[PDB]
Design an enzyme around this catalytic site. Sequence first.
Site, PDB file in Angstrom:
ATOM      1  N   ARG B 102       6.784  -3.516  -6.525  1.00 47.84           N
ATOM      2  CA  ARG B 102       7.074  -4.807  -7.150  1.00 47.84           C
ATOM      3  C   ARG B 102       5.844  -5.323  -7.901  1.00 47.84           C
ATOM      4  O   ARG B 102       4.705  -5.000  -7.550  1.00 47.84           O
ATOM      5  CB  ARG B 102       7.539  -5.835  -6.104  1.00 47.84           C
ATOM      6  CG  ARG B 102       6.721  -5.844  -4.813  1.00 47.84           C
ATOM      7  CD  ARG B 102       7.388  -6.660  -3.710  1.00 47.84           C
ATOM      8  NE  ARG B 102       6.962  -8.057  -3.711  1.00 47.84           N
ATOM      9  CZ  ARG B 102       7.577  -9.031  -4.377  1.00 47.84           C
ATOM     10  NH1 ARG B 102       8.661  -8.765  -5.102  1.00 47.84           N
ATOM     11  NH2 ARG B 102       7.111 -10.272  -4.313  1.00 47.84           N
ATOM     12  N   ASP B 162      -8.718  10.525  -2.508  1.00 48.33           N
ATOM     13  CA  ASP B 162      -7.631  11.497  -2.612  1.00 48.33           C
ATOM     14  C   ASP B 162      -8.163  12.915  -2.443  1.00 48.33           C
ATOM     15  O   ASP B 162      -7.621  13.722  -1.676  1.00 48.33           O
ATOM     16  CB  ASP B 162      -6.919  11.361  -3.961  1.00 48.33           C
ATOM     17  CG  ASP B 162      -6.051  10.118  -4.049  1.00 48.33           C
ATOM     18  OD1 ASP B 162      -6.596   9.029  -4.343  1.00 48.33           O
ATOM     19  OD2 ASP B 162      -4.820  10.240  -3.843  1.00 48.33           O
ATOM     20  N   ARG B 165      -9.270  13.816   1.120  1.00 52.14           N
ATOM     21  CA  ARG B 165      -8.114  14.222   1.912  1.00 52.14           C
ATOM     22  C   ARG B 165      -7.654  15.625   1.522  1.00 52.14           C
ATOM     23  O   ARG B 165      -7.424  16.480   2.387  1.00 52.14           O
ATOM     24  CB  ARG B 165      -6.987  13.209   1.722  1.00 52.14           C
ATOM     25  CG  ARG B 165      -7.294  11.832   2.301  1.00 52.14           C
ATOM     26  CD  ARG B 165      -6.190  10.826   2.005  1.00 52.14           C
ATOM     27  NE  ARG B 165      -6.391   9.568   2.707  1.00 52.14           N
ATOM     28  CZ  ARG B 165      -6.112   8.382   2.187  1.00 52.14           C
ATOM     29  NH1 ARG B 165      -5.617   8.300   0.959  1.00 52.14           N
ATOM     30  NH2 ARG B 165      -6.323   7.280   2.895  1.00 52.14           N
ATOM     31  N   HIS B 189      -4.596   7.319  -8.343  1.00 54.28           N
ATOM     32  CA  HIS B 189      -4.769   7.189  -6.898  1.00 54.28           C
ATOM     33  C   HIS B 189      -3.432   6.722  -6.343  1.00 54.28           C
ATOM     34  O   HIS B 189      -3.087   5.542  -6.439  1.00 54.28           O
ATOM     35  CB  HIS B 189      -5.864   6.199  -6.520  1.00 54.28           C
ATOM     36  CG  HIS B 189      -5.814   5.780  -5.077  1.00 54.28           C
ATOM     37  ND1 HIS B 189      -6.219   6.605  -4.048  1.00 54.28           N
ATOM     38  CD2 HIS B 189      -5.381   4.638  -4.491  1.00 54.28           C
ATOM     39  CE1 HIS B 189      -6.055   5.984  -2.894  1.00 54.28           C
ATOM     40  NE2 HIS B 189      -5.540   4.790  -3.132  1.00 54.28           N
TER      41      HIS B 189
HETATM   42  N1  LIG Z   1      -8.605   2.705  -3.635  1.00 56.90           N
HETATM   43  C1  LIG Z   1      -8.337   3.116  -2.362  1.00 56.90           C
HETATM   44  O1  LIG Z   1      -8.505   4.295  -2.102  1.00 56.90           O
HETATM   45  C2  LIG Z   1      -7.855   2.089  -1.315  1.00 56.90           C
HETATM   46  C3  LIG Z   1      -7.620   2.456   0.007  1.00 56.90           C
HETATM   47  C4  LIG Z   1      -7.194   1.530   0.960  1.00 56.90           C
HETATM   48  C5  LIG Z   1      -6.992   0.217   0.620  1.00 56.90           C
HETATM   49  N2  LIG Z   1      -7.254  -0.163  -0.575  1.00 56.90           N
HETATM   50  C6  LIG Z   1      -6.931  -1.588  -0.931  1.00 56.90           C
HETATM   51  O2  LIG Z   1      -8.001  -2.612  -1.388  1.00 56.90           O
HETATM   52  C7  LIG Z   1      -7.805  -3.920  -0.671  1.00 56.90           C
HETATM   53  C8  LIG Z   1      -8.348  -4.160   0.775  1.00 56.90           C
HETATM   54  O3  LIG Z   1      -7.416  -4.258   1.623  1.00 56.90           O
HETATM   55  P1  LIG Z   1      -7.918  -4.909   3.209  1.00 56.90           P
HETATM   56  O4  LIG Z   1      -7.346  -3.801   3.993  1.00 56.90           O
HETATM   57  O5  LIG Z   1      -9.390  -5.012   3.020  1.00 56.90           O
HETATM   58  O6  LIG Z   1      -7.079  -6.214   3.167  1.00 56.90           O
HETATM   59  P2  LIG Z   1      -7.408  -7.517   4.062  1.00 56.90           P
HETATM   60  O7  LIG Z   1      -6.307  -8.510   3.955  1.00 56.90           O
HETATM   61  O8  LIG Z   1      -7.871  -7.032   5.385  1.00 56.90           O
HETATM   62  O9  LIG Z   1      -8.836  -8.298   3.280  1.00 56.90           O
HETATM   63  C9  LIG Z   1      -9.204  -8.430   1.988  1.00 56.90           C
HETATM   64  C10 LIG Z   1      -9.981  -9.741   1.692  1.00 56.90           C
HETATM   65  O10 LIG Z   1      -9.943 -10.212   0.379  1.00 56.90           O
HETATM   66  C11 LIG Z   1     -10.198 -11.539   0.342  1.00 56.90           C
HETATM   67  N3  LIG Z   1      -9.987 -12.280  -0.906  1.00 56.90           N
HETATM   68  C12 LIG Z   1      -8.751 -12.607  -1.546  1.00 56.90           C
HETATM   69  N4  LIG Z   1      -8.974 -13.299  -2.656  1.00 56.90           N
HETATM   70  C13 LIG Z   1     -10.375 -13.436  -2.780  1.00 56.90           C
HETATM   71  C14 LIG Z   1     -11.247 -14.066  -3.763  1.00 56.90           C
HETATM   72  N5  LIG Z   1     -10.760 -14.722  -4.885  1.00 56.90           N
HETATM   73  N6  LIG Z   1     -12.607 -14.018  -3.575  1.00 56.90           N
HETATM   74  C15 LIG Z   1     -13.048 -13.346  -2.427  1.00 56.90           C
HETATM   75  N7  LIG Z   1     -12.332 -12.735  -1.473  1.00 56.90           N
HETATM   76  C16 LIG Z   1     -10.981 -12.794  -1.677  1.00 56.90           C
HETATM   77  C17 LIG Z   1      -9.416 -12.158   1.517  1.00 56.90           C
HETATM   78  O11 LIG Z   1      -9.960 -13.303   2.046  1.00 56.90           O
HETATM   79  C18 LIG Z   1      -9.422 -10.954   2.483  1.00 56.90           C
HETATM   80  O12 LIG Z   1     -10.316 -11.103   3.548  1.00 56.90           O
HETATM   81  C19 LIG Z   1      -6.258  -3.935  -0.757  1.00 56.90           C
HETATM   82  O13 LIG Z   1      -5.851  -4.234  -2.074  1.00 56.90           O
HETATM   83  C20 LIG Z   1      -5.860  -2.478  -0.309  1.00 56.90           C
HETATM   84  O14 LIG Z   1      -4.646  -2.030  -0.815  1.00 56.90           O
HETATM   85  C21 LIG Z   1      -7.629   0.753  -1.575  1.00 56.90           C
HETATM   86  C1  LIG Z   2      -3.026   0.667  -0.124  1.00 61.08           C
HETATM   87  C2  LIG Z   2      -2.762   2.001  -0.597  1.00 61.08           C
HETATM   88  N1  LIG Z   2      -3.821   2.830  -0.173  1.00 61.08           N
HETATM   89  C3  LIG Z   2      -3.763   4.180  -0.123  1.00 61.08           C
HETATM   90  O1  LIG Z   2      -2.704   4.722  -0.495  1.00 61.08           O
HETATM   91  C4  LIG Z   2      -4.995   4.996   0.417  1.00 61.08           C
HETATM   92  O2  LIG Z   2      -5.575   4.502   1.419  1.00 61.08           O
HETATM   93  O3  LIG Z   2      -5.244   6.051  -0.172  1.00 61.08           O
END
Ligand SMILES: NC(=O)c1ccc[n+]([C@@H]2O[C@H](COP(=O)([O-])OP(=O)(O)OC[C@H]3O[C@@H](n4cnc5c(N)ncnc54)[C@H](O)[C@@H]3O)[C@@H](O)[C@H]2O)c1
Ligand SMILES: CCNC(=O)C(=O)O
Lengths: 335, 326, 326, 335
Positions: B102, B162, B165, B189
């Site tokens: 979405r 990626d 893994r 990714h």
């Molecule tokens: N690229 C990759 O390989 C990969 C892998 C895993 C997760 N991620 C992702 O990246 C992010 C992290 O997820 P999490 O597990 O850390 O989530 P989470 O909810 O545990 O925390 C993320 C933080 O961001 C903060 N935040 C939101 N708006 C903000 C702003 N304007 N200024 C400062 N802080 C702000 C929140 O307060 C929150 O604490 C997600 O988008 C998740 O999907 C990416």
């Molecule tokens: C939030 C999505 N994240 C993933 O798919 C990863 O951890 O690779």
Amino acid sequence: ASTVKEQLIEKLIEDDENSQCKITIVGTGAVGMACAISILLKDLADELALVDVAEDKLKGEMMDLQHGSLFFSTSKITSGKDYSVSANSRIVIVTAGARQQEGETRLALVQRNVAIMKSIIPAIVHYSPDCKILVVSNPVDILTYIVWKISGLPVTRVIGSGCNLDSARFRYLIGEKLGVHPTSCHGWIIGEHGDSSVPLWSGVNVAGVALKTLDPKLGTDSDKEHWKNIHKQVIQSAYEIIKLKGYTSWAIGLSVMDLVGSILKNLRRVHPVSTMVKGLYGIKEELFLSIPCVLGRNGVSDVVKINLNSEEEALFKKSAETLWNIQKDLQFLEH
Amino acid sequence: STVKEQLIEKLIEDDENSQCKITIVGTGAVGMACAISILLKDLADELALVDVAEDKLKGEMMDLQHGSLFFSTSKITSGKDYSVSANSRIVIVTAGARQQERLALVQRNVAIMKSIIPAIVHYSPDCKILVVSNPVDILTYIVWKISGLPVTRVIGSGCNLDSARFRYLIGEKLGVHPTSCHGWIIGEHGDSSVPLWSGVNVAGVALKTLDPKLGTDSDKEHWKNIHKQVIQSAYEIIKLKGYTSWAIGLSVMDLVGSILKNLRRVHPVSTMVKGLYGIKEELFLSIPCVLGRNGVSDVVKINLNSEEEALFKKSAETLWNIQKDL
Amino acid sequence: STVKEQLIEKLIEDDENSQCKITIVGTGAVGMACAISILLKDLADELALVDVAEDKLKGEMMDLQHGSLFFSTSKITSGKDYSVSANSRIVIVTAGARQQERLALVQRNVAIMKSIIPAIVHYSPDCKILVVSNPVDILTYIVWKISGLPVTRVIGSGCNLDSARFRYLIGEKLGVHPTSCHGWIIGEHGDSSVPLWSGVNVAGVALKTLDPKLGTDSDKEHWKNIHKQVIQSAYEIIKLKGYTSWAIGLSVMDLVGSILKNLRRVHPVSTMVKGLYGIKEELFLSIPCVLGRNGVSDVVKINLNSEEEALFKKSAETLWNIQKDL
Amino acid sequence: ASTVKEQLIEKLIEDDENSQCKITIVGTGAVGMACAISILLKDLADELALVDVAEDKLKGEMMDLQHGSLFFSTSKITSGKDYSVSANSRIVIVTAGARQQEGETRLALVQRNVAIMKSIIPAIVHYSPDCKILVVSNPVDILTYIVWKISGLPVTRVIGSGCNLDSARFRYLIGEKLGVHPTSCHGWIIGEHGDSSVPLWSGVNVAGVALKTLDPKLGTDSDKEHWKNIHKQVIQSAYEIIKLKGYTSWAIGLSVMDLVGSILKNLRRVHPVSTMVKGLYGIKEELFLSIPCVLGRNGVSDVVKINLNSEEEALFKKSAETLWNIQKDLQFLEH
Ligand SMILES: NC(=O)c1ccc[n+]([C@@H]2O[C@H](COP(=O)([O-])OP(=O)(O)OC[C@H]3O[C@@H](n4cnc5c(N)ncnc54)[C@H](O)[C@@H]3O)[C@@H](O)[C@H]2O)c1
Ligand SMILES: CCNC(=O)C(=O)O
Ligand SMILES: NC(=O)c1ccc[n+]([C@@H]2O[C@H](COP(=O)([O-])OP(=O)(O)OC[C@H]3O[C@@H](n4cnc5c(N)ncnc54)[C@H](O)[C@@H]3O)[C@@H](O)[C@H]2O)c1
Ligand SMILES: NC(=O)c1ccc[n+]([C@@H]2O[C@H](COP(=O)([O-])OP(=O)(O)OC[C@H]3O[C@@H](n4cnc5c(N)ncnc54)[C@H](O)[C@@H]3O)[C@@H](O)[C@H]2O)c1
Ligand SMILES: NC(=O)c1ccc[n+]([C@@H]2O[C@H](COP(=O)([O-])OP(=O)(O)OC[C@H]3O[C@@H](n4cnc5c(N)ncnc54)[C@H](O)[C@@H]3O)[C@@H](O)[C@H]2O)c1
Ligand SMILES: CCNC(=O)C(=O)O
Ligand SMILES: CCNC(=O)C(=O)O
Ligand SMILES: CCNC(=O)C(=O)O
């Protein structure tokens, strides 16, 4: 689109070659490369530059280090007799010179190493104006003063390796006696590095327990435990290593690596290094000796005022007078 | 006269010019996974944390500082105002909502970038921005356009994880350490990542050399399921634990190291690929780039084969059409 | 013939005799904080995780394994059955409910120890058991009696973390790295911990030497609030973040290192103190012990002063009367 | 209750002195201590034991290492001419002997180092029966065979340092050409360590891109890019370092540290080390050369079957015949 590099790699920007955590070592002898391999295996430097006047030995030591590039993370190793490779170093380590002790030593060698510093310090400071100079060559407390005068740099940025190693030796033997890791025995050597260093038994301790608390005669001759002979072994285990293998390299290298870490990482740890002590512990002349110093990215930022007792302060000041006249003993040759 | 006054004689005024500072924005699961990994590898002289959750941000920061005696980073700071992030060499963006690649939620995280990236770049004008939040290839593009920075200094964590893994599962099948099993995942990714079986190898031995149907459905060994796992492992973890933290933190720590130490290692990270593999628009996707102290200094030109180029260009357009929706 | 068969000639059957294995029991906040800290310091050849939450345990374990390419630990395993914990050199117990030093919850975590410690010791007969769960001084005693092991091989994380906080706050007041500020917290991990201002020092300079009312209410500098903070910092963190993970993970990683590498460093950890400072019963409390490859090999005999000994013996009895309630 | 140690420390158990990750280095020359300082700064060993017949130099090198105890984590450093200090080592590193190349070399030195192994291997194996022996002394492919015969140990547990360094040199120069960290250039040298090593250009690659894909003449003389001269520099940059500084120590030490890590940590990484190749790549005699090997806590657990092409396999087998007759060239002196 013809050559492999052109075919495989699209350059997007011209690569920088202005490292931002760079180290130059001046003198690629035993101590120099001991410093080098230790700094490399701790990843304390982006770039490591090497300087020496033995152009052949310098080139060989550098290639040997380079061939290990796969096994460490320093990405550029360079060398050269011209101090342009020194450029924009965070720290310049001075390891060049003849091997000798301090205090009671022949002036011909003291003056020889003084000559070396006159040759290199002006250039080193020209190419790396904001650097700290870490002096290792001996007599270390005298050359650090000499370097500081020549360099015209702030006193806080010119540092002698001093008693960091002495205290490490001190803590190693305390550890053997007690059967405890040296990291947990705490004890301080200050003043002259080598023959006339001052042990501060008042502070030797484990877990906050002063050892002279448990043995009021600690460090006196009357001591039936003969803890003072630890300090004499601190001093003479060095002499003994020189007798048995011909020089010292490994521990000083680790000691320099200890100090380099504290400076670059701006840890603000306390180490006994040589700084200028005029105005401290009753010193009224311009000379360098080791006291506890807070070490950070700017060199010596603060110093510790240990309240020396009457016996300690006496030896400290005696040693201070020794170096003073030797600093005077070079001026009278440089008429 | 105080203890400090009597104990310590000040000789110079200590500087707050951290020569190796790092800021993490968003102290969530992924944020503090990055944080602790950076701290135990001594890759930063100063670590600054920023978040909107003031209370959580202060608790996280304090919990880290109480461990100061066990690592070498000298200063840890936090704050909702981005002034404390000033003069970072790298700013790692991990803020956002847990998502995938979405649209109500994609815009939700784009809203975040629009409000943080300006202050971030204002206070750290020479920084590199490492984008971790998802959709990473999308948001890296968003962050780049917001920042006004050179393309080479905005980088998505991308397919570094990626590929890590990919190599772990190749290593378990072969009984060899992942470091010695080489294999590459590029493109998105996520679900449309592209495996390059062309170059999967050990000791220089192309694996498809030994089984020419490597990576097809025809394959009797079914190596193509290792790629399916590369994608589904993440989903599995999220169902069982709730999220992904540890591996991505490690992957970020890997990238941060190549950048700061200027190693010039090749990682598959998200950069803007207009001009390559017949990509005509501005979109970010992971390809092999050389990382140094300025971010991407070079990119590797892999001659993608018939089918690889197809999905990469498909992967590419999927994103381009998600981007145009404002 | 497979790729592996064609690529790799097996010469010997690879052993599953990990010579430096570690098990963590309870993969919660504290459990996996320990886990990642151990992994980035390469202190274990094999890391095994155990928990009752099968789903979470598998997600945590997988998330760690996907980062295999970024650390050196060769094998990571999980399982609800303690067979996978076999032949650990150290088992770190972090299972339980978040608590402090009401009794309904103390018995709740004692219920846990009674069901895990037997299987743990059965499979790893030569292990050291590092107890982290709270009440730590209590449960270390419980674990010891359950295990039937020598007293020197059951150790509570104890006041290692307390002292790390003590030194961080002393360092901020003085402007010196915590490593160079020395100070000791012993006794209870918690609210009745005992600060030894006797030995608080920098470079061997006793700080009370310079301000003889150090640590009293009389003190004009109010150093005694640094101890109040040592205790209240933990509470603060728990109110703001919800729990404590990072510092304790680091403290565990510190202890694990002294043990495995047999360094013989002195840490203030929970051991059984019957015979010292006039303690007449079997209770565990933190005092300075020498840690090596067999756990506590030696303990330091600090001559506690008039007031210190009083609260230590009070701290002691608080616990003894909590223990006797079955 | 009289002495400090008794007053401050209550012994609860008698301390163990049976380390469980122990390393002995035999030969404390340039290579030996390069190995030593590298193993120490990577904390790969609980205990490090040193052996040499220069009793004075051995004692001095050990004390110098000990005085650095505060700066690393290895908690016990020992030394001695009697191999009892070797006891229960996980790995014994053999660095003793004269300096020489391989293949074309004077038998007087080849035989001299063979004599050294006859002296030490029986003892080393007596005191550390379950150890792996990591042979560094040159000619390395021949002495590894010699050691293996004398030791009577499994072939999987006797390993030559071989071409791990050669490949590191190879990857370093590839990196310079392309401007990429060596960790990212992948390329393999196998066979004899030194003068007659075999480069496998078929596999040289970056990010999975074969370089001969982009330059079909890679490694031939016809190559207008002259990539083959990289391999000749792999070989002769060693010679050049010996000319300029007199020996090689730093890179081999890092190379040994690489291998020690893989073994002790049981990483199962692939390295080009010397194992016995009879029954591989058409070899029908008992000789040692470098091929890609999976390295774990038990030594060489598996080996990689690279399909050598006709030119590669020819040089591999030629080199195999070379060592074979030299192994035969020692037997005829040991009548
Ligand atoms: N690229 C990759 O390989 C990969 C892998 C895993 C997760 N991620 C992702 O990246 C992010 C992290 O997820 P999490 O597990 O850390 O989530 P989470 O909810 O545990 O925390 C993320 C933080 O961001 C903060 N935040 C939101 N708006 C903000 C702003 N304007 N200024 C400062 N802080 C702000 C929140 O307060 C929150 O604490 C997600 O988008 C998740 O999907 C990416
Ligand atoms: C939030 C999505 N994240 C993933 O798919 C990863 O951890 O690779
Ligand atoms: N502070 C300490 O604790 C400590 C400990 C051990 C040794 N040291 C000492 O420091 C020195 C190093 O000892 P070594 O054993 O390393 O010496 P070494 O003989 O091995 O060589 C050191 C180098 O100095 C170089 N040199 C001379 N003039 C030069 C110039 N103008 N520019 C650049 N390089 C020049 C030489 O070429 C030589 O290679 C000695 O003075 C020794 O006593 C100090
Ligand atoms: N000593 C210290 O310095 C210190 C500091 C902080 C927290 N702690 C504490 O130690 C524990 C960890 O707290 P958390 O933050 O990790 O809590 P948490 O709820 O996040 O997770 C702990 C895990 O224990 C597991 N568990 C319960 N019974 C089990 C059993 N029989 N076998 C296996 N696993 C079982 C649960 O499944 C849970 O995942 C708490 O008791 C907490 O108070 C101690
Ligand atoms: N495999 C490689 O890639 C590689 C690289 C560089 C050097 N090497 C080589 O290995 C050796 C070491 O070179 P160095 O420069 O370290 O030599 P060196 O002269 O510095 O001394 C090495 C030590 O061997 C010792 N020794 C002789 N007989 C002994 C015995 N019976 N027991 C114990 N020790 C004994 C000597 O006392 C001497 O100290 C040489 O053969 C050299 O060619 C191999
Ligand atoms: C030769 C001067 N250096 C020493 O004495 C030492 O090693 O401390
Ligand atoms: C659960 C209680 N924990 C603490 O008080 C701490 O983290 O020190
Ligand atoms: C002297 C033999 N060793 C070498 O040639 C080398 O350094 O590889």
